[model samples]
Target: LKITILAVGKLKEKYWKQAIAEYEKRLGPYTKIDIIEVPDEKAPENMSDKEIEQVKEKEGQRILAKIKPQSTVITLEIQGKMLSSEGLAQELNQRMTQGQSDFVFVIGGSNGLHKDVLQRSNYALSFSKMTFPHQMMRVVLIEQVYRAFKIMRGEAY
Candidate 1:
């Protein structure tokens, strides 16, 4: 099995990079973990609401491009449906049994995901009611993904 995270922007902080590296090492034995970062669109804070959506769509284009039809796409959205860690494990297991082994998790840029990405997603997941830095989401997502593997394998996290 292989898991690919298609996220917007580069993770520049050393702490964040280190955190991701640790999870990658832990996930090494279970499955291949691939993280793909796309360049974020340049935007000013004073943009109008429609402009923000435009920026998201521009970034969204890249997000969709990385996805292949054979892979299952899971996207992170604050208003998306919620799931417990165990249920998430079950969901992935079901997908695998259905012949899916390549999973792509999408994390949008700071402004949020565009309509295009939302429509393209096979599964939409939410971790919290509040929003955090987009970069922070990367760390949280990888850890939970690793946790899911441990649970699916009947091992302690």
Candidate 2:
């Protein structure tokens, strides 16, 4: 199966980029993992709610364009269902069994995902109750995908 991670922005921090690369390398034997970076909507940290919403809309458009018709789009949202590692493995296995060719996972910008994008998702998931920086969240998601693959293949964790 092909797993693609579409995120809002590039990880400017070298350490985080390195960490993501490590997990991607570890995941190579199981599934093909691709990290696609979308241009971040430019806005000040103190931007008003309205401004943030506008930014999200633009980023959403870019994200939607990257989605493939055959791919199952999974949006990451705080309000989404939180599944355990084993549960995630099972869910993924089911998709593989059903012959899913592509899976796309999205990480939204600071303002979160746009309504249209969320509505288009086949699954919406959350890792934890606490919020995380968008860049950090990408790393976490990559690691979990790797872990899920290991669990699926009956390999030692």
Candidate 3:
């Protein structure tokens, strides 16, 4: 199976980069993982709500462009459905068995995902309702994905 993560912004912190790299290495044997980082739009100081919305729209467009045709698109949103690790494993297995090979996970920027991107997603997942730094979220996402794969293989938690 192939998994692609289209996330906004680059990981600048050394620790975050290291943590993500570890998960990527662990997932190497199970599936192909691709992480594509799109440039984040800088938010001007004291920006208006409308200005923030515009930034989200621009980033959303870039993110939508990166999605592969026919791929199962999963968007991470606070209001999305919450799933346990085992549940996520089952979902991934089912999709794979059903002949779906490409899984695309979308992580939006600081301003969050636009309405259109959320509407286009095959699944909307929520790790938590609480807000988190986008960089930190990336690490969490990769780890969960790795855990799901391990669960699928009947490995211990």
Candidate 4:
């Protein structure tokens, strides 16, 4: 299976970079993975709610542009469906069985995703209801994906 993670903002911290790299290496045997970083819009300190929404909209367009035709889009959201690691593995296996080889997982910016992006998703997944920094969330997301792959192969976790 081919998996793509389209995330807004680059990882500036060395620790985050290392963690992401480690998971990528672990997942290499299971599936091809691609991480695409989209430029994040910088929010001014006094930015209003309306401005933030506009920023999300712009970033949403960028995210959507990178999506391939007929790809299964999964957007990460706080209010999305919660699933265990095994459930996620099942979902991934099912998609592959259904011939959906190209899977795109979208991680939005600080203010969250635009409605259009969510509307385009085949699945809206939530790791937790609690908020997480976008940089930290990337690490968590990759680790879960690695876990899902391990679960699928019936390998030791």
Candidate 5:
């Protein structure tokens, strides 16, 4: 299966980059993992709620553009349901059994996802109740995705 992670902003930290690379390398044989980074919408540090909403909408549009019609889209959001690695594997297996060709996972920017993006997603998955910066979230997501694959294949942990 093809797994695509669409996210706003790039991973700049060395450790985060290294961790993502490790998972990507480890995941090479099981599934095709791709990370597509979209430019983050520029905004002031202290902005009004309206500005924040506008930025989120723009980022949402960028993310929406990357989604494929045949892909099952899932968004990562604070209010979304949290699933363990094994549970994620089960969910992924079910989708695959349905003949899904692609699994698209979305990671929103600092302000969060827009309503339209959230509505378009097949599932909303939350990694944690506590909020994380977009960059850090990307690393965490890659690791979990790798773990899900290992669980699905019955590989050694």
Candidate 6:
């Protein structure tokens, strides 16, 4: 199996990078993993809706470009379904069973995903009803992926 995480911006803090490294090491035995980051668009607080949309559009284009062909695209959105850890494992397992070997998870920055990015996504999954720092979300995503693999094996997460 192959998994790709498409995220916006960089992880400046050492702690977040460390957390990602931990999960990467844990998941290495299960699947080939790739984490790709697109440049983040700057948005001023006073920016209008049109401007925010513009930022999302640009960021979305970059995201779309990196997706692997025929891969299952899952974008993290606030309005997405809140899935249990086991449920996530089931989803991944089901995909593998159906002959899907490539998965991509997109994590947007402050402006979230654009309609274009959403259009390309096959699934929208959420961890909360609230917002999170994109860097934190990246760490959470990788950790959950590792946890899902453990759950898939019927092992303690």
Worst 10 residues of 2 by lDDT: 68-77
Q: Write one digit per residue (lDDT tens) for candidate 5, span 1-157.
A: 7989899988879998998999989888889999999888998979899999999999999898888776799999888888988889999988898888698899998889989899899999988899899888988898888888889888988
Candidate closer to the true structure by TM-score (higher is better), 1 or 5: 1
lDDT of 3 by residue, 33-142 (tens): 99999888888856789998899999998998888679899999989889988889999899999999999999999889988788889999999989988999999999
Q: Cα-based RMSD of the predictions, in order?
A: 0.8, 0.9, 0.9, 0.9, 0.9, 0.9
lDDT of 5 at 43: 85
Quantify how close model 1 is to the true structure by its C-alpha RMSD in Å. Answer: 0.8
Candidate 5 yields a Cα-based lDDT of 0.89
TM-score of 4: 0.97
TM-score, prediction 3: 0.97
Model 6 over residues 76-104: C-alpha lDDT tens digits? Answer: 99899789999999998998998999999
* Cα lDDT tens digits for candidate 1, 15-81: 9999999999999999999999988999998899989998999999988888887779999988988
lDDT of 4: 0.91
Name the TM-score of candidate 6.
Answer: 0.97
lDDT of 3 at 138: 94
Tens digit of per-residue lDDT, candidate 4, span 49-89: 89988999999999989997799999999899899888899
Model 6 residue 58 CA deviation in Å:
0.3
Q: Write the per-residue lDDT of candidate 2 for residues 16-48, one digit (tens) a residue.
A: 999998999999988889999899889888988
Model 4: residues >4 Å from true position, as ranges? none
Task: Score residue 67 of candidate 4 by CA lDDT.
Answer: 90
- lDDT, candidates in the order shown: 0.92, 0.91, 0.92, 0.91, 0.89, 0.92
